[PDB]
Amino acid sequence: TNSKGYRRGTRDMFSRPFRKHGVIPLSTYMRVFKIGDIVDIKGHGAVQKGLPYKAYHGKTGRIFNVTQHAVGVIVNKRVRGKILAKRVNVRIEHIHHSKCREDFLRRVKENERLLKEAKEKGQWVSLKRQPEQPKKAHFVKKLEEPIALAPIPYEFIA
Amino acid sequence: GLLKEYEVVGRKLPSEKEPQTPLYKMRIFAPDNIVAKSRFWYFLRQLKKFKKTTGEIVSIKQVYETSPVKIKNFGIWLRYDSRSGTHNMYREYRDLTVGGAVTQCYRDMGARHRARAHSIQIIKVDSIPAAKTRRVHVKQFHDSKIKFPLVQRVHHKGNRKLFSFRKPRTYFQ
Amino acid sequence: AKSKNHTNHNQNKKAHRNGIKRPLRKRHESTLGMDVKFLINQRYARKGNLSREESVKRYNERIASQKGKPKPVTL
Amino acid sequence: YIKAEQREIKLRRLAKKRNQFYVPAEAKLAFVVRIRGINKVAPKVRKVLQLFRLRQINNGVFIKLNKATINMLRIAEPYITWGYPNLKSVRELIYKRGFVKHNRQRVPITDNFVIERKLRQAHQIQCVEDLVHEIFTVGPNFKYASNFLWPFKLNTPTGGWRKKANHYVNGGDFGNREDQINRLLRKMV
Amino acid sequence: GIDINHKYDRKVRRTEPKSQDVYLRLLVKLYRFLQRRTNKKFNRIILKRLFMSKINRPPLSLQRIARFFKAANQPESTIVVVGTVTDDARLLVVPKLTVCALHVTQTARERILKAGGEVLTFDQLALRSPTGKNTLLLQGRRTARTACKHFGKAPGVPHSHTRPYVRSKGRKFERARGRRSSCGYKK
RNA sequence: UUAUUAUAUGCACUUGUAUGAUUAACAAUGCGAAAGAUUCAGGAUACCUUCGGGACCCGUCUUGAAACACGGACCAAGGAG
RNA sequence: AGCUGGUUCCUUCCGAAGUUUCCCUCAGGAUAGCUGGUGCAUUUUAAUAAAUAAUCUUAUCUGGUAAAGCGAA
RNA sequence: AAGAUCAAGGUUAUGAUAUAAAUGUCCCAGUGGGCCACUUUUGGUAAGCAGAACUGGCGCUGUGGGAUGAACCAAACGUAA
RNA sequence: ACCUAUACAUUACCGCUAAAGUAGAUGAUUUAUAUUACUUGUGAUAUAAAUUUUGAAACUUUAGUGAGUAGGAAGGUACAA
RNA sequence: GAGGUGUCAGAAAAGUUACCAUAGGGAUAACUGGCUUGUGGCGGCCAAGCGUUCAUAGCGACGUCGCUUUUUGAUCCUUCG
RNA sequence: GCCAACGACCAUACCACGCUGAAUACAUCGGUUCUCGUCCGAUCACCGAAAUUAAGCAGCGUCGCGGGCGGUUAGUACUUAGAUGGGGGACCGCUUGGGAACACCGCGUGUUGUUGGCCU
C-alpha cells in the first residue's frame, strides 16, 4: 500500500544535472522579490532548508509574503475537487522570477508606443495580437532556374 | 480511386530574416486535391524532413494528360508493402492514360499480391518508346499484323424481356 | 474475497460537473504569515492617514523648505 | 463580390503569361458541420464541440480560420466535415436556415430590418446579405455576427460515403476538402 | 444528439410571492402594472422585493430610519422599507419623516406618528410617487440570525467562530476535547 | 461619354401579392329528409378474421436475468416508511 | 438482525455511485466526491465590458517516460 | 513594504463561447460489490484471471447494425407524416 | 444507383423549461357617416353600427429540448372519515 | 509534559463442535460446464547423429511450432431458499 | 590591451605540451624582533631589504584533450489523434499533428559588471 512520504519519486526532481554541480551561486538572492510578482518554483535539492514539497515543483504562484529568509508563494493546486489555495514558504534558492509577467509589461509599453504613433499618423491603431493567418499571393520567380525533380523510393536496404 | 494526376509544391515556412526555402514538387496520383497534398508530404518526408504544419503548401494544381487518344506503353516502377515483406516491381501497362495506367495498376496490384492501396508507393513514370518493352504480354500488341480473334461474348441479361422465349443461343453463327 | 483498491475512474468527470472553481483576485487583500511586524505599523499607517489634501500639502511645503535628502539613497 | 472574383482571375492570368507562378492568397473562413454523435465521444472533443455550439448532428456554424481554431478542428476531425464556403452557400443558409439568438430564443430573420435590428452599430450592416458579407470576408465584428446566428441545422447531402470516419484523402469524407465543399454544402442546405 | 442541453434550465427565482396573502399580491399586481408601464427601477425591484421570503425580509429598526437622515441630500425623504418596521427604544429623538412600509409594529407606529410622521401603505406611496420621487429603499440585516452563525460548522481549517448546535451552554457542554490545546486539539 | 439601378410615380378602385403555421377560388356528390330515419365518411373497443413485423417471466438480490438463479398453481380480501 | 425476502396509485422534470478517508473496518456506516431540491445575490455573465467562468491558441515554467547511450557516471 | 492619496493613457490590449453564472442552505438522498472496450501496463504460460493509468460505455440504453448478443459500431429514444 | 434508426431536416400536435405582454371599462378600441376646426389632408365632437365583463394565484404569445435505475422534487387520481 | 493501546484515529479476552443450531452467501471452497493449457496426452518442423554404406526404412539431439482439453494446476462466470 | 581588487554567469574559463609577459601590479621571492600559529616560521603571524616573469595568474599557439552551438543525423526514431485499415498473432502500413539522441561535420577556446591604476 502506496507511496507516501514527502520525497517520493524525487531522485530526478532534486537532481543537480551534470556540470551544474555544487553551491548555489549568489545571483539567485540578488533578484529582489516583491509582493504580487509571479514566481516559478524550481526544486534545488542542494538547499535542503525551505524545500518545496514535490507537487509544487513547476507549479507557479504569486507572492503574498516576504519573510526574513523565505518567500511565501500562493500556488493554486487542483485537489479532488475544489482548488484550495496554499501559501507555501519556500526559499529564493528554489524561487526564480517568472518572465511570463514581463511579456505583459512589454506589451503595455509597446501598446502605448503604437497608440501614440498611430494617433500622430492620425489613423489607425490595431495593437491587438492576431495569430498567424493564411498569408498571401506568393509569386515565385525562377531566377536561378526552374524546379523539377520528383522523388522516391528504392528504400530496401535492411 | 478515380486516378487524377496532380502537381503539388511545398516550401517549409516563410521567415523574412530566413530566405526562400527550396521548392520541391511531385506528380501524385489521387482522385482528390486533398489526397494530392496528403501523399505529397509523405513522399517529401522521405528525402527532406518537412512536416505539415511546419510545412508550407504552396500550390495544388492538376496536370493535363498530354495524349489521351495516344496509344502508348508505360513502364511504371513500383514499391509495395507485403505483410513481412517490402519489395520492388517493374510492370508495364498499355493504356490511353497515365491516369488509366495507374488505375489499372492499383487494381492489378490489389489482386495478385493483395496489394493494399495504402501499401503501394509510386515510384516513377515513363512512356516506353520502342522495344524497351520487356513486357511479353505488352509486346504482343506491338506486332505487325495485329488482327486477333474475339473469343466469346457477354449475354445482356436477358434481354428487354426478363422472359426470353427466343433462347440465348450461345451459337452466334 | 478480493475487492479492488483504487480507481480514479469518473473522478475527473465528477469535478467538471459542478466546476473545480478558482476563487478571486481579491482587491480586498487577505493576510497570514506576514511577519506580525509589518502588520503592526500597517495598522498605524491606515490610522495616521486621517484625510489628506491639507496633510500632503503641508509636508510638500516642508520638503521645499528643508531640501532635504541628497544623503539617504547613497547610504 | 464580383470584383473579388475578377482580382483572383486576373492575378492568375498576368502571372502565367509572364512565366511567373502567382500562387493565389490562402483561404480564410471555414464552415464546419457535425457528422458525429454526441455519444461515444472522447471529452476533449466533446468540450470543443459545445464551444463551437454544434449541438446536434448536421448542425453547422461558421468558424473563423485562425491558428487558434484550426487545432480544435484537428481534434474534432473524425467528428466534423469542413470546407471553404462560397457566397452562394452562405446566402442559401441565412435566408432559409438562418435564425437569430435574442435572449435565448431562436428568432426568424427575413426582414432586412431585423438584421439592421442589431448589426447597424457594426456599420455598414443593415441587411440580411450584409450579415453574410461580414461572415464571408471575416469582417471585424465576426465574433458578434457569428454569435447572432444560431447553428444552421441541415438535412443530409446526397449520398455521403459509407466510410465516413476516414480522412478525405482515403475517400472518407472528414477533412478540409477545400473547394469541393461547395458541391456538398449547396446540396445539403 | 444535443451537446449539451444539460442544466440549468429550472432557474432560481420566484415569479410570484410564495404567500396565500391576498393583500400582498395586490401590491405585487399594482407594481407589476407600474413596472414596464413606467420604466424606472424603483418599480422593478419593489415588485421583486414583495416576492421575498420572510428571511431576506428581516425587520428594519427605527434607529436605522434615523441614521439615514444624517445622510447628505436626504432630508426630504420618504423612507421605503419593504418589511416589518420595529421600534428601537434607544433613539431619544426620532426625526419627522413619512415612512412607507408593508407592516409597522404598533410601538413603531406611535414613535413615527409622535415625530410627527405619517405611517403609510405602499399603495398610497405608489400614488404619491409613481416615479419613486424622494424615496429611500432600506433592506434589513440578515446577518443577525442564529442560523447564519451555525453555517460554516467546520473544525480543522483555522476558522470558524460558528456556534456548535448545543441545546445547553455550560461547563461539561462541549468545553473539552477538541475545543482546547489541552484535551488534544485546538478547534 | 455611355449603360444600369433607385428617388422625384399621388388618389380612387381592386375576388390582385405578402401579412411572418396565407388551402382556397371554382364545382360536383352524400344529406340535416318533424317524430321517424335513409345515405356517406371514419374506428385493433370487447372479440372474431385475414396478412406482415415485433413481443422470451414477472418480482428481486446481482456486473449482467428469458435463464438449467430464488418466491409465485389460480382468485378475492386483510397487508408494510 | 449490518442479513434475506417483501413494501401498497400515476404522470411530469431533473438524475447517480460502486470512489476518498477512518472504523474488530472488509456483507455496514460515518466522511468527502458525485445527486436533487430549496432558493439568494448580480446580470453589460438582465429583464422594455475596461466584470468573468473555462477550453483552444499564444507567451512563460516544469518533467526523466518513449526513444537514445554504454568508445558518458 | 503594505495601506494608500493624485494625476497621465485611442481601440482594453489571444481565439471561440456562456447552455446565464457565482454563492448558501439541506448537512440531503442514493453510493462505498462494479463490469467492459480503445490505448498504456503489472503479476501470471495464460484465462470469459488478479490488479493500475487515461478516456468512453454498460451499471441507468432501447432503436438501427454486428444472423444472434448488457457492453463493440452507428446512435442517446415525446407523438406522427 | 439503391435500401435504411425513435439519428438527421420540416411540419402539426403533447409536455417542460425559456422569453414577452396582458391588468384606464363612470373607460378603451375599431368601423361608417354628418357637422365643425385646419390644409391638400387630419383631428375634435355628435349620431349610427360593432368588439371588449381576462381563475390577470391565468391566458394569449413565443422558442429550445425530452433515454433513464437508485433517488429527489413538482402536480393529480382513487379510498374512508 | 510523560506513562499506551503495533488491529499503531485507541475492544480488556483461550480451545473444540464429525452431537451441533441459525441468519445468509455462488461476494466463497468441494462439484458439473466455460476460459486457459504451464503441466499431461497426441502430432509436426528443421536435422547433429544412430542405422556396414547411406541424416529421415525405423529413429532422432540441441532447438522450435502446434493441437487436444481426455491429466493436473491456474480461475470462480454460473449453481450453496 | 594589460593589471589589481571585488565579482557575475559558470569548463569557449579545464587539461596537456611549448612560447611570451613591458608598466601601476598579483605572483615569483627573502628576513624572523614582535604579535600569533605551527612537531617544523612549509602554512599561518609579522618585517618588505636582494633577485624574476620560468611558474602561478594572464595571454598566445595547438586540424590536440575536453567543452559549447548549429547543421548533418532525422521528420527518421518515437508518439498524439482515426478507421467495420492490414496481419494468425507478434505487430505493421496509411492518414492528421508534434518531434529526438548518440554520431559526423563546421566554427569558437572565457566574456563581462563595479572600482583603482598602468599602457608597451
UniProtKB/TrEMBL annotation, chain A:
<protein>
    <recommendedName>
        <fullName>Large ribosomal subunit protein eL21</fullName>
    </recommendedName>
</protein>
<dbReference type="GO" id="GO:0022625">
    <property type="term" value="C:cytosolic large ribosomal subunit"/>
</dbReference>
<keyword id="KW-0687">Ribonucleoprotein</keyword>
<dbReference type="Pfam" id="PF01157">
    <property type="entry name" value="Ribosomal_L21e"/>
</dbReference>
<dbReference type="InterPro" id="IPR036948">
    <property type="entry name" value="Ribosomal_eL21_sf"/>
</dbReference>
<dbReference type="InterPro" id="IPR008991">
    <property type="entry name" value="Translation_prot_SH3-like_sf"/>
</dbReference>
<dbReference type="GO" id="GO:0022626">
    <property type="term" value="C:cytosolic ribosome"/>
</dbReference>
<dbReference type="InterPro" id="IPR018259">
    <property type="entry name" value="Ribosomal_eL21_CS"/>
</dbReference>
<comment type="similarity">
    <text>Belongs to the eukaryotic ribosomal protein eL21 family.</text>
</comment>
<dbReference type="GO" id="GO:0002181">
    <property type="term" value="P:cytoplasmic translation"/>
</dbReference>
<dbReference type="InterPro" id="IPR001147">
    <property type="entry name" value="Ribosomal_eL21"/>
</dbReference>
<dbReference type="GO" id="GO:0003735">
    <property type="term" value="F:structural constituent of ribosome"/>
</dbReference>
<keyword id="KW-0689">Ribosomal protein</keyword>
